[PDB]
Amino acid sequence: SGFRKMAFPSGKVEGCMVQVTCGTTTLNGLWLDDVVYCPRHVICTSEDMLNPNYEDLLIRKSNHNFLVQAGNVQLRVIGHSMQNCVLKLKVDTANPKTPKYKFVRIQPGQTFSVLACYNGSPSGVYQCAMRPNFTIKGSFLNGSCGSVGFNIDYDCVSFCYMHHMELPTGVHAGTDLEGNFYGPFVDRQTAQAAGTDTTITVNVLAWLYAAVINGDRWFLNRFTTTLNDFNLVAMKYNYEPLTQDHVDILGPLSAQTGIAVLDMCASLKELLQNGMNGRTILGSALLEDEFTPFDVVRQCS
Numbered sequence: 304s305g306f307r308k309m310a311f312p313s314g315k316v317e318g319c320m321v322q323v324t325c326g327t328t329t330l331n332g333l334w335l336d337d338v339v340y341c342p343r344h345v346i347c348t349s350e351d352m353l354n355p356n357y358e359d360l361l362i363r364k365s366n367h368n369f370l371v372q373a374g375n376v377q378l379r380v381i382g383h384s385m386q387n388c389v390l391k392l393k394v395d396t397a398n399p400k401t402p403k404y405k406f407v408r409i410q411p412g413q414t415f416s417v418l419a420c421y422n423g424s425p426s427g428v429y430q431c432a433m434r435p436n437f438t439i440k441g442s443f444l445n446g447s448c449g450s451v452g453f454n455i456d457y458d459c460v461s462f463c464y465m466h467h468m469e470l471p472t473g474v475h476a477g478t479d480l481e482g483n484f485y486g487p488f489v490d491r492q493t494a495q496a497a498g499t500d501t502t503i504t505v506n507v508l509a510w511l512y513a514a515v516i517n518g519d520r521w522f523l524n525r526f527t528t529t530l531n532d533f534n535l536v537a538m539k540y541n542y543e544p545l546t547q548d549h550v551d552i553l554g555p556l557s558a559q560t561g562i563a564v565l566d567m568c569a570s571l572k573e574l575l576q577n578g579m580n581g582r583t584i585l586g587s588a589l590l591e592d593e594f595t596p597f598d599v600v601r602q603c604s
């Protein structure tokens with residue numbers, strides 16, 4: 304029993320974190336086999352923060368301009384290339400701590416763990432979600448660029464996020480490990496703003512199913528709804544639309560508990576209307592939306 308925001312064990316990722324320095328700029332890099340991945344704006348200068356020409360800046364660098372330190376060890380860079388917004392640095396040494404890994408691009412609503420790092424050293428691990436507006440609500444200070452987000456399923460680390468920047472609202476933007484941004488953001492310091500954010504409805508429903516599984520029933524009601532009528536209500540609360548994929552995806556938790564998906568949607572409609580009147584659900588007085596249907600199945604059963 305019990306229900307916690309649970310991150311993945313971070314040890315496989317810790318063994319991959321290094322420090323990358325170009326010029327006066329230092330940030331974190333990800334050392335997998337003989338390649339170090341890091342945000343390409345490490346090669347920017349103060350003057351070049353608004354409209355960097357990364358192709359121009361990179362053609363002017365030689366390998367010896369890049370200082371890579373794994374612990375006390377300086378790694379020798381033997382090549383450099385750019386892939387979208389990520390720099391790939393070839394090193395003379397393959398990382399002996401390289402886990403089984405893959406790079407994955409995730410979709411909004413997906414969760415992952417973040418290993419926040421500074422100067423190549425881990426500071427902490429926490430659980431995050433890709434918001435519908437393609438930002439993440441992280442905990443990042445300056446120098447944390449290059450920290451990565453990941454899931455571990457079996458013994459394989461799936462890297463899905465690299466941190467590049469903080470926007471003016473204090474939310475964070477980054478890329479997948481192929482260097483493509485999530486969302487419409489760019490690695491420039493020009494004015495950028497996140498779209499309006501919404502609540503991840505399928506994750507809320509998944510968490511209410513987890514609550515029923517942990518014996519919490521006070522928010523259930525005798526009603527059901529249509530998918531269409533529910534979405535008309537939810538949009539009015541800045542909840543995301545619920546699709547039939549979402550309904551299919553909750554199928555298992557619906558089976559496990561006896562409550563149809565559209566019955567639980569009726570309970571969510573009512574909670575949006577009344578709030579919790581002092582009560583809590585699985586320990587929260589707000590509706591939690593950073594647990595996926597998949598997370599709920601692995602922590603409860």
Ligand SMILES: *CC(=O)N1CCN(c2ccc(Cl)c(Cl)c2)[C@H](C(=O)NCc2cccs2)C1
Nearest residue numbers: 330344445446447448467468469490491492
């Ligand atoms: C994450 C980190 O370690 N930071 C280093 C500086 N930085 C950036 C440098 C260059 C560029 Cl092109 C970008 Cl987008 C970010 C990070 C950051 O969030 N900069 C602050 C910004 C000011 C205006 C827009 S982003 C922090």
